Design a protein around this nucleic acid. Structure first.
Ligand SMILES: [Mg+2]
Ligand SMILES: [Mg+2]
Ligand SMILES: [Mg+2]
Ligand SMILES: [Mg+2]
Ligand SMILES: [Mg+2]
Ligand SMILES: [Mg+2]
Ligand SMILES: [Mg+2]
Ligand SMILES: [Mg+2]
Ligand SMILES: [Mg+2]
Ligand SMILES: [Mg+2]
Ligand SMILES: [Mg+2]
Ligand SMILES: [Mg+2]
Ligand SMILES: [Mg+2]
Ligand SMILES: [Mg+2]
Ligand SMILES: [Mg+2]
Ligand SMILES: [Mg+2]
Ligand SMILES: [Mg+2]
Ligand SMILES: [Mg+2]
Ligand SMILES: [Mg+2]
Ligand SMILES: [Mg+2]
Ligand SMILES: [Mg+2]
Ligand SMILES: [Mg+2]
Ligand SMILES: [Mg+2]
Ligand SMILES: [Mg+2]
Ligand SMILES: [Mg+2]
Lengths: 63, 136, 48, 109, 48, 63
RNA sequence: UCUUGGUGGUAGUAGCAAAUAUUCAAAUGAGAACUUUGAAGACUGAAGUGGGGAAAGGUUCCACGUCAACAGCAGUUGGA
RNA sequence: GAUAACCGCAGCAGGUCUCCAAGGUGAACAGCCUCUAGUUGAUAGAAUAAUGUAGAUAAGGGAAGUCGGCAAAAUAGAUCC
RNA sequence: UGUACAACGGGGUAUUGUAAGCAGUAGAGUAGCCUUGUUGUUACGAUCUGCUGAGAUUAAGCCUUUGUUGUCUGAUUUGU
């Protein structure tokens, strides 16, 4: 019972949820859902997706 | 599977049927592995035998060193790219399929594995664990 | 009740749970409790 | 109780037109206003104003609004009245939004 | 009522997941108490 | 009644199509005796039949 | 597997599903899903579902009256 | 002068010679949308079982299917190399 | 004639991804006014920023409801 963090969106991953990705350089990615997952494969920067955790630190929202 | 494997495996989703060409992840000279058959396969009418991570297959080489080509050799799948479920609920997958050339007992032909190895594969096959670096 | 006594080691295994999922099954829910949703998201525009 | 009555209603046509064929969303929306007036005003004869038919069909056959705002008025059927002595006339109500509005009783004064 | 998922330790010696955690679907059955409102007696006959 | 012959007559009188002839619905009684073309012209004089102006094809976005 | 005519079961069955699509009100009427008018939605989209013609047809054109049959539903409408 | 006036048993998705030809997109008399004009005709209503017909999408594999890659997918314009 | 049911409304939950409007000394710049700034001005300007994880949708087979407005005796048949 460790809660993982989404590699794209910064959401909290509870057990069973989402997919884990192993990129070919063996860097482990973790998605909470298929919305994090598909926008990862689509080559989207999390800094430009307005609801992600990394956007809100970049835009100083909710400090 | 069959003989050579140290331990048993939980059932992993079968990603790789016969005719699947997977990359070859060791330094034997083979560039890919074309699966002709899967060890331990159940006999069902019309069902292609389908390999999975940690399984031992029989394979040929379609690209690579000429002395490795035109022969049937055992191989062991180390990466899968079809999302399978672990017993702790983790669904995971690789970007590619990969396998290493083995003998019938499970000794490596190669000496080094380029990339990650599924932990189910490393636990089932001690020699693959010996030459693997990062394991998932 | 079971119609036979079962001593099969999958029975007789004393089970203690560690966590129970209470996220919304109405979507791909992300929070176990509304306190956790209010803590992650902070304050919203919604009235007081 | 009172027979001649006028109330204003909101109808959620979104949940009534859910999954309907696209060539029949606005035809069915007409038939759901008549079902909605027969449920509320109780009368089987429902006459919809031609301005309401303009409101249903404003955005084409498949572009019915999620919420209409209707002024249904139960009235006295005249001139050799039908099986029922009452009918309901259904009016559009000119609102910028049909959201967030309840059922009110419009008085004739 | 519906299903949800849990996490528990596995107590299965000789399994590969012994003392490790597993993620299991459970079904939840909403069970209020039942009111006893009668009795019925059955006799053994040659027809049943 | 049957004003089908009063719309074809009125289209040929005002010189537009039958898609652009507005017969007065509230004067359906007196339109129905306008069987002749002069009677149709008389109903164009007093606005009982209206020319129904053209549907706009604006060129503003094209420009 | 006669000839001519008549009649059944199948059977109120199969079916009446190409060509985006109809809807509201009023009028007429015994009777309106289908007629007429208005309103609305749409389409052919100028190598047109638009205006004319050749061959062929022959009155089908137009008006009034009419609805038994015909328009494989209907019909107050119609090339009837 | 034809998805009802012709021929095809008939008000048959068939066939039958020709003139005129608006705006945009675009290379275009293409496809798509609109103006003038025209039509809104084709039995309807309700429901959304199976099997169909027509259109789609599909994880991982990628012709192992099959007599045979049949069907589908993939490619697609233009500029430069 | 109810700890009733319905239609709306409220809350939750969820999906998407930050609405419209207003504002800005943000904006590649360009064209004018110059009583020429140097965080001038007028016009035009993809985009960006703030209000704003906003706005929209949310049962049609989601959940919940002290709200609002209604509804609650039509028909047929059955006997040892
Ligand atoms: Mg669910
Ligand atoms: Mg549907
Ligand atoms: Mg005979
Ligand atoms: Mg017969
Ligand atoms: Mg039938
Ligand atoms: Mg049918
Ligand atoms: Mg078209
Ligand atoms: Mg069009
Ligand atoms: Mg006549
Ligand atoms: Mg008939
Ligand atoms: Mg008849
Ligand atoms: Mg005629
Ligand atoms: Mg002949
Ligand atoms: Mg016919
Ligand atoms: Mg053009
Ligand atoms: Mg051009
Ligand atoms: Mg059709
Ligand atoms: Mg596939
Ligand atoms: Mg794929
Ligand atoms: Mg073959
Ligand atoms: Mg075969
Ligand atoms: Mg082909
Ligand atoms: Mg070129
Ligand atoms: Mg924003
Ligand atoms: Mg804005």
């Amino acid at each position: 019972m460790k809660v993982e963090i989404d590699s794209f969106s910064g959401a909290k991953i509870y057990p069973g949820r989402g997919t884990l990705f192993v990129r070919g350089d063996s860097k482990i990615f973790r998605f909470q859902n298929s919305k994090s997952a598909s926008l990862f494969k689509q080559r989207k920067n999390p800094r430009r997706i307005a609801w992600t955790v990394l956007f809100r630190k970049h835009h100083k929202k909710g400090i | 599977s069959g003989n050579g494997a140290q331990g048993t495996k939980f059932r992993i989703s079968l990603g790789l049927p016969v005719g699947a060409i997977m990359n070859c992840a060791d330094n034997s000279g083979a560039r890919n592995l074309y699966i002709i058959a899967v060890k331990g396969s159940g006999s069902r009418l019309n069902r292609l035998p389908a390999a999975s991570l940690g399984d031992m297959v029989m394979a040929t080489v379609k690209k690579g060193k000429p002395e490795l080509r035109k022969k049937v050799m055992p191989a062991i799948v180390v990466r899968q790219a079809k999302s399978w479920r672990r017993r702790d609920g983790v669904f995971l997958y690789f970007e590619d399929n990969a396998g290493v050339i083995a003998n019938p007992k499970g000794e490596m032909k190669g000496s080094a594995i380029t990339g990650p190895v599924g932990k189910e594969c490393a636990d089932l096959w001690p020699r693959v664990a010996s030459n693997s670096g990062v394991v998932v | 009740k079971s119609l036979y006594t079962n001593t099969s080691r999958k029975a007789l295994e004393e089970v203690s749970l560690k966590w129970i999922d209470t996220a919304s099954k109405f979507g791909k829910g992300r929070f176990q409790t509304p306190a956790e949703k209010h803590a992650f998201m902070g304050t919203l525009k919604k009235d007081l | 109780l009172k027979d001649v009555v006028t109330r204003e209603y909101t109808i959620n046509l979104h949940k009534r037109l859910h999954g309907v064929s696209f060539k029949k969303r606005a035809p069915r929306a007409v038939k759901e206003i008549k079902k909605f007036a027969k449920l509320h005003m109780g009368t089987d004869d429902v006459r919809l104003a031609p301005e309401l038919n303009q409101a249903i069909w404003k955005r084409g056959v498949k572009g019915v609004e999620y919420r209409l705002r209707l002024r249904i008025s139960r009235k006295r059927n005249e001139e050799e009245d039908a099986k029922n002595p009452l009918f309901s006339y259904v009016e559009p109500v000119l609102v910028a939004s049909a959201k967030g509005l309840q059922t009110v009783v419009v008085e004739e004064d | 009522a519906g299903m949800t998922t849990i996490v528990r330790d596995l107590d299965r010696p000789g399994s590969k997941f012994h003392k490790r955690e597993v993620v299991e679907a459970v079904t939840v059955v909403d069970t209020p108490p039942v009111v006893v409102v009668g009795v019925v007696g059955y006799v053994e006959t040659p027809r049943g | 009644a049957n004003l089908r012959t009063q719309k074809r007559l009125a289209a040929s009188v005002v010189g537009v199509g039958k898609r652009k002839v507005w017969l007065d619905p509230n004067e359906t009684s007196e339109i129905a005796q306008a069987n002749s073309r002069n009677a149709i012209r008389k109903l164009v004089k007093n606005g009982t039949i209206v020319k129904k102006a053209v549907t706009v094809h604006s060129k503003s976005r094209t420009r």
